Amino acid sequence: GSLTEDGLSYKEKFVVRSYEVGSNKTATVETIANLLQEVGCNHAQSVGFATTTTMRKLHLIWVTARMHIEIYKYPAWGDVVEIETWCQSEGRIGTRRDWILKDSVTGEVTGRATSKWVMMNQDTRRLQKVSDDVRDEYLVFCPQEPRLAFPEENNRSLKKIPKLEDPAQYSMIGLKPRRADLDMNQHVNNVTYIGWVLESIPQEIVDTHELQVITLDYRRECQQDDVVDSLTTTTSDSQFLHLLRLSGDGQEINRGTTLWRKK
């Protein structure tokens, strides 16, 4: 991979692997989500980071608040997908990371994604606004004019998500992470929550539809010793409302929505 000519964005090419595809021989949305985090990580490394010097001094880290992905075509096993990524400040609210996915052979846009990140103290887990000190440290690596993967006014990436009401239409209970679900810092990888959300969608929907859009809000982290319940209700194309909560006390960890198109 490499930074682009202006040094304000980053591109990387990936060849879709045999174990990365589902039963239609195309990349799963979890493989796509892993590729998004890998290209994001390579972008941060390329510009010297993903915490700044002031963030390290104050024990602050970036945490995902929201992930939104729209796929038009899933790349097939053996296909090359090119992913471009960039960051932008959202004032003191936090930061945003966007991605564009393209078919390497045709140059056609096959997907797009956007994510909202908030600053959090590593130890107390207290959310915070971004200080002007940290904003100045990453502004030199971001486009100055707004650049959006989802520019449209009133688009799906900014819609409020309601809380699923019991009883859920579908459920998958007792989900728990194994060591492969953890990241290098021993926290549950953000992509695992995408998998857990999808576990409560009936297999018949998966067999007859393709996932077009997924919006996921992250409220609380699942610990390596926690147990999760995945809940889904049809709200409709087929649309669903999702809720992930702790198996015991019912504490919310995520809420989301999915939109599926008939094959």
Ligand X SMILES: Fc1ccc(NC2CCOCC2)nc1
| Structural contact between residues 53 and 137, judged by C-beta atoms closer than 8 angstroms | yes
Q: Compute φ and ψ for 143, nearest 5 degrees.
A: -65, 145
End-to-end CA distance of the chain: 33
User: Based on CB atoms, which residue is closest to its own copies, 78 or 162?
Assistant: 78
Active site residue 142: no
> Which of 48, 124, 146, 178 is the binder for its own copies (CB under 8 A)?
178
Contact between 96 and ligand X by CB under 6 A: the answer reads: no
Active site residue 222: yes
Q: How far apart are CA 19 and CA 226, in angstroms?
A: 27
Q: How far is the CB of 211 from ligand X (least distance, A)?
A: 20
Q: Which does 97 bind (CB under 5 to 8 A by kind): ligand X, its own copies, none?
A: ligand X
| Structural contact between residues 110 and 101, judged by C-beta atoms closer than 8 angstroms | yes
In DSSP notation, 9-62 reads -EEEEEEPPGGGB-TTSBB-HHHHHHHHHHHHHHHHHHTT----HHHHHTTEEE
Contact between 37 and ligand X by CB under 6 A: the answer reads: yes
Site string for its own copies, 236-255 (x = CB under 8 A): --------------------
Q: How far apart are CA 35 and CA 32, in angstroms?
A: 5
| Structural contact between residues 181 and 242, judged by C-beta atoms closer than 8 angstroms | no
User: Based on CB atoms, which residue is closest to ligand X, 46 or 169?
Assistant: 46
Contact between 184 and ligand X by CB under 6 A: the answer reads: yes
Which of 185, 190, 242, 254 is an active site residue?
185
Q: How far is the CB of 11 from its own copies (least distance, A)?
A: 15
Q: Which stretch binds its own copies (CB under 8 A): 119-127, 131-139, 193-201, 215-223?
A: 193-201
Which of 187, 190, 209, 242 is an active site residue?
187
> Which of 3, 8, 11, 22 is the binder for its own copies (CB under 8 A)?
22
Strand boundaries in the chain, DSSP class E: 2-3, 10-15, 60-71, 80-89, 95-103, 109-121, 127-128, 170-175, 209-218, 228-234, 238-246, 252-262
Contact between 93 and its own copies by CB under 8 A: the answer reads: no
> Which of 29, 33, 35, 44 is the binder for ligand X (CB under 6 A)?
44
- What's the full length of the chain, in residues? 263
Contact between 51 and ligand X by CB under 6 A: the answer reads: no
Q: Which stretch binds ligand X (CB under 6 A): 40-48, 141-149, 172-180, 203-211?
A: 40-48
Q: Which does 206 bind (CB under 5 to 8 A by kind): its own copies, ligand X, none?
A: its own copies
* SS3 state at 1: coil
- Of the candidates 46, 48, 49, the one whose C-alpha atom is nearest the C-alpha of residue 61 is 49
Q: How far apart are CA 211 and CA 71, in angstroms?
A: 8
Q: Which residues bind its own copies (CB under 8 A)?
A: 17-19, 21-23, 25, 28, 30, 34, 37-38, 41-42, 45, 77-78, 174-176, 178-180, 182-186, 189, 191, 195-196, 198-199, 206
Catalytic residues: 185, 187, 222
